[PDB]
């Protein structure tokens, strides 16, 4: 067998080109690799530690907007919700 | 003669499909010539029927001409038998189509006029719908398949096999036979003979495997096809009446001229 990284699995029902059978395709795939990214207000999840534990680190540090990819407003609301959750004995 | 038809008679037209000269040249002159050449080919032209001549002499380089001329006569006879003429204006009164006819869009996927069920052929209608999706699809495929033939040939509605499993449309060129069992595997047998000659004096594996498996049927070896209808794509039938630009007009007249009674009368029962 060979390492799965070095191989490319062409999905089912998809068209392909001969290029797809090449290291170029895998390399191009590597280089070019939710609830809050929506109309939902993150400040309504302040009592739901499971949901907003996805937007923190293993130690609990809120993730930068560069990571979360949220809008500025939803980043601010999410940070407020996480801090409030930390204060009220959850989180 | 054994070739003579009933609804076709010298000195008369086929109603809206052919004119007097058109039918004279499409049917009578052509049958006369083919007979006059098949008699040269063999003396069995009267001793035996056409299909017996086609099948017995099949796959014969030496007896090629018998097969060619018998096949052409049989195909032409079938095609002109299936027709009855239509009510559309006679082809000789109508003006001949010019180059502009090439720019007209066909309406085979919008309109349909002459159907099996209209004349009382419910079984043929149902079989065609089961085999070709719809009657409009069948008409489109038939007319396009015949119109696509550049030179001499026929388009055959054919029931695969007395029982039929499914209907199909097939094309034969230059007196080809709609029947498949007689001539199936011929090139493979010739390849085996050629290879044996070489032995006396793997690509073989791939080529012969592909040949045999392509010709291999579904749970059988020989796949037979039973003609139901025939359309003549030869220039010899439509040039005189419709001109260079009028093959499609001729095919539309043919569709309006089909007698579905005979076609249903030819159906191999059912499986």
């Amino acid at each position: 067998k060979i390492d799965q990284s070095l191989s490319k699995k062409l999905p089912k029902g998809t068209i392909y080109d001969p290029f797809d059978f090449s290291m170029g395709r895998i390399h191009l795939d590597r280089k070019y690799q939710d609830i809050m990214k929506s109309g939902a207000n993150p400040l309504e999840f302040y009592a739901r530690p499971r949901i907003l534990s996805r937007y923190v680190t293993s130690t609990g540090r809120i993730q930068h907007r560069d990571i979360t990819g949220l809008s500025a407003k939803n980043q601010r609301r999410l940070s407020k919700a996480i801090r409030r959750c930390q204060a009220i004995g959850l989180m | 003669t054994r070739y003579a038809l009933e609804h076709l008679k010298e000195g008369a037209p086929l109603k809206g499909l052919f004119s007097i000269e058109g039918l004279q040249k499409a049917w009578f002159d052509r049958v006369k010539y083919l007979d006059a050449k098949l008699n040269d080919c063999t003396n069995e032209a009267q001793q035996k029927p056409l299909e017996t001549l086609i099948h017995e002499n099949s796959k014969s380089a030496s007896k090629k001409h018998i097969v060619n001329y018998a096949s052409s006569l049989y195909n032409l006879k079938f095609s002109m038998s299936s027709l009855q003429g239509c009510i559309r204006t006679p082809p000789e009164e109508c003006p001949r189509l010019g180059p502009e006819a090439l720019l007209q869009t066909p309406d085979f996927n919008r309109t349909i006029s002459n159907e099996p069920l209209t004349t009382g052929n419910e079984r043929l209608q149902a079989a065609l719908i089961s085999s070709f999706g719809s009657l409009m699809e069948f008409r489109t495929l038939l007319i396009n398949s015949n119109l696509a033939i550049s030179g001499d040939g026929f388009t055959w509605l054919v029931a695969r096999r007395i029982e039929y499993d499914k209907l199909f449309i097939l094309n034969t060129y230059n007196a080809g036979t709609p029947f498949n069992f007689s001539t199936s595997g011929v090139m493979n047998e010739l390849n085996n003979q050629y290879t044996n000659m070489e032995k006396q004096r793997a690509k073989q594996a791939k080529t012969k495997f592909i040949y045999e498996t392509q010709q291999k049927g579904f749970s059988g070896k020989e796949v037979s096809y039973i003609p139901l209808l025939a359309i003549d794509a030869s220039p010899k039938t439509w040039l005189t009446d419709y001109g260079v630009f009028g093959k499609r007009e001729y095919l539309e007249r043919v569709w309006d001229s089909i007698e579905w009674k005979i076609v249903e009368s030819r159906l191999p029962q059912r499986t």
Binding site: - | S58, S60, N68, L102, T172, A175, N191, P235, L239, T240
Partner: protein, 244 residues
Amino acid sequence: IHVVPKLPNSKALLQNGVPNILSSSGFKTVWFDYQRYLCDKLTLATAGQSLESYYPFHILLKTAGNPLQSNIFNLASSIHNNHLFVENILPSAKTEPSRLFLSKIKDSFNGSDWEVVKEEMIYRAENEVLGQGWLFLVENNEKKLFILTSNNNGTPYYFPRNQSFDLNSAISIDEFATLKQMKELIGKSTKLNGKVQDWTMPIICVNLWDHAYLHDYGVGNRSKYVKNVLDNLNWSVVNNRIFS
């Protein structure tokens, strides 16, 4: 757009056809309608594509090896053939075969006369072309003149598309071996398109299509038509077609 070429003396051609071969309504069927029909179809099949910039000879050479472009090839072939034929039966643009043409006949057809080769061409067209096709007298790279009969719209230039054998009916082992050799030679080419070199060029071309003889001769009698064609060739053109 591909347009039908203007012929020399078109008015006389429309008034009295070609003397000794075609009537006015026969030449109109074979050229002024068939060539127009073919050029319109080629235009519709190649417009908006690269092939629209190429002459039919170049189109048929480009598309000869591509199976899916066969229809275009057919059109591009027939058009080309139909002008090779018309050109060498037109009254003018008393012509006689050149010394070089007859010399090459004697060096190719077993030292036979031109009339004997004409009869051989009649026979070849009569037998090996059932239905539509073309009759050619062609020159190979070996300076050898031989008779070639194509079915439908085969070309004389490119041997894998000669279409000289009717595979609808039975064939002799000689023909099958010829096809096998040609297939092997095609496979022998290194070019990715899979094309081969073929320097065969047509010297004489006769249109065996129903558009040429049917109106003026009938369902039979194509042998009479071919005889009239070969007895009344424009030998200025045919002599110019042979390399000096």
